[PDB]
Each structure stands twice: as structure tokens, then as C-alpha cells.
Amino acid sequence: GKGTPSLGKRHNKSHTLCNRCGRRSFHVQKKTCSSCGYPAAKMRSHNWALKAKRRRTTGTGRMAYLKHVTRRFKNGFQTGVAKAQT
């Protein structure tokens, strides 16, 4: 009754893909993501889930801009172009 026969009536997704994190944690009826908290301004994160922070944090993606801030700082945040040596 409550096992195999009832498990056959599962064809209505409670969650769909999230637009912020793309993870399929976006609750359809609540219009909220259970993973990242979208559409709230802040990202959902808790100190009681330290392993969850590992999965989605700085360094787990591309860091396409923070990659180069260290290299730009070491040169004093240069403006201009390089001069060819004589």
C-alpha cells in the first residue's frame, strides 16, 4: 500500500532548475531555491554545514577576475602600456 504501489504515482516534480545556481533545488510552489536561497539577495549558507560551503565557494569556479588581482597588485596596479627597450 504505502510502498511499491504508492511509489508508482511519482510524476510531478516538486523542484525544478534554479536560475542562480542551476542545481534543481528551486521549489516550484514556494518559488525559492532550497540550495542557494534564490531569489534572496544573499546566498544561503550556514555554519552548521561546513561541507556545503566547500561545494560552492570562491575557487570552485573560474575566478575569472580574482585570478589576476594578485598579479595586478604586485605591479602597483599599472596604467599605460609597456615600453620597448632601445
| Known binding-site positions for Zn(2+) | 18, 21, 33, 36
User: How far is CA 22 from each of CA 43, 81, 84, rounded to the nearest angstrom?
Assistant: 14, 40, 47
Dihedral sign, Cα of residue 60, residue 28, residue 34, residue 15: negative
Instruction: Find the binder of Zn ion among 2, 7, 36, 45 (CB under 5 A).
Output: 36
Grid cell locating 13: 516534480
9 binds RNA (CB under 7 A): yes
33 membership: H or E segment, kind and range:
strand 32-33
Task: Identify which range of 1-9, 12-20, 41-49, 52-60 contacts Zn ion by CB under 5 A.
Answer: 12-20
Residue 13's binding partner among RNA, Zn ion, none (Cβ under 5 to 8 angstroms by kind) is RNA
Q: Name the grid cell of 50.
A: 561546513
Residues that bind RNA (CB under 7 A): 1-16, 19-26, 28-29, 31, 34-35, 38-44, 46, 49, 51-52, 54-75, 78-85
